[PDB]
Each structure stands twice: as structure tokens, then as C-alpha cells.
């Protein structure tokens, strides 16, 4: 499926059990959720951008559905304003940008 | 060209003449770019990120190339840690994401 940009690029994914709606971000290196609550251990981090820096919760080896797709690797979780896929699960659904 | 993201999807892009390299972001809904001189006059603008919201300046009808793809269109500066092409001129090139 090709995706266009008049909007913004809002997929659902399912994690934890439950659906969300997220944001496929190819300017985010790493995936961050809103705060939830997940299984296993993390390590503290801090990411930057626009506004400042936030602290997040750092999990590794999770599963990811994204558009019926089962993808596996690290997610950040804190205080983000919205759910964003990085980069580091685009790839592994295979997804590019072309123009 | 396809981009794919396994690394960050940085081009260069050439604005006053000058080259500069910044990131194809998805998820920024706007262009912001580093401090730099642009012509005309501004007004403000107050755009939320992962770590608030904060007040860039707005300027419009900005002459802006990228990856030898001419547009023209609406450029914020304010603090950021990279050079943000967003959607608003993504889609003037014709860029999609897809898998
Ligand atoms: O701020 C955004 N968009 C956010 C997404 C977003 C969308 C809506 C609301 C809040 C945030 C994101 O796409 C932009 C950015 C820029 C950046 C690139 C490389 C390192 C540091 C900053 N890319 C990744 C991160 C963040 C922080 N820094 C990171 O390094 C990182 C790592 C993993 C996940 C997310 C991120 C960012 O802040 O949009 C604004 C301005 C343009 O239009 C509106």
C-alpha cells in the first residue's frame, strides 16, 4: 500500500493486547509510546527534539503488530504527546519513502 | 529514488544559495530548519514537539531545493537539533511512504 502525506501518516498497531492508533515517523530513530505498562526489565534514557528533552522507559525485544504485521525490536516509553514508529520497526515491515 | 530507513533519510537540500543537509521527517508536520537569515518579514508561530511546545519563526513563499526538486513554500526557524523537512513540502515533491 502506498501512503500519501496530505495528512498525517496514522496506522493502528497492536501491543500489550490492545489497539492504538501511532504515527510512522521516518525522522524518529527508535519507536515511543505513551506511558503503559509492559513485562520485562528497562534502562532510563532521554530523548530530544522540539521542546526539549523527556525521559523514557527503554524495553528491548518487544512485539509490535503494525498493519497486521509482526515486528520485533527496542520501544521507549514516557510522556510523548502522540505514539511514534521509528525507523528502527519501519525496516522491518519493509517501508520506504520514494519520491 | 527509493529511500529506505535503516539509516537516518538525510539529503541535502539548497536554500539562499547555500547546501545544507536535513532529515525527511514524517512526523513533523512542518519544515523547521536551524537559526539562519531569511528574507522578508516573519510572524509567530507556536508548534508542539516531543517536548512541548514552543515559538519558531514563520516565513512564507521560501524558495527551498530538494535532492534537485524545486518548492516553495512555508520554512520555520527556531532552536532544533537537525534541519526538519516535513510534510508540508514532502508532499510538494511527491513523496510516499510505502510497504
Ligand atoms: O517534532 C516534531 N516531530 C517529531 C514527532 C512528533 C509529532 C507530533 C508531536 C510531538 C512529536 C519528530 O518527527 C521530529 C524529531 C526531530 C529530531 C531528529 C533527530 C534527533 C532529534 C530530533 N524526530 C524524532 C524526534 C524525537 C525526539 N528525539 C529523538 O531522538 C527521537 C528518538 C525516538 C523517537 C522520537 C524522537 C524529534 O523530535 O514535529 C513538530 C515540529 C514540526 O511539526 C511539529
Redesign the interface.
Known amino acids: ?6 495528512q ?2 496514522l496506522v493502528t498497531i497492536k501491543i500489550g493486547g490492545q489497539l492504538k492508533e501511532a ?7 527508535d519507536t ?1 509510546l505513551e506511558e503503559m505498562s509492559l513485562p520485562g526489565r528497562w534502562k532510563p534514557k532521554m ?8 525521559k523514557v522507559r527503554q524495553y528491548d525485544q518487544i512485539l509490535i503488530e503494525i ?1 497486521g504485521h509482526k515486528a520485533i525490536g527496542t520501544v521507549l516509553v514516557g510522556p ?2 502522540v505514539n ?1 514508529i521509528g ?1 528502527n520497526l ?2 522491518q ?7
Chains 1, 2 share one sequence.
Open positions: 500500500p502506498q501512503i500519501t502525506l496530505w498525517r501518516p504515527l510512522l515517523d521516518t525522522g524518529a530513530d515511543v530523548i530530544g527534539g522540539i521542546g526539549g528533552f523527556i498493519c510523548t504527546p511514534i525507523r519501519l525496516t515491515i519493509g517501508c520506504t519513502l520514494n519520491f
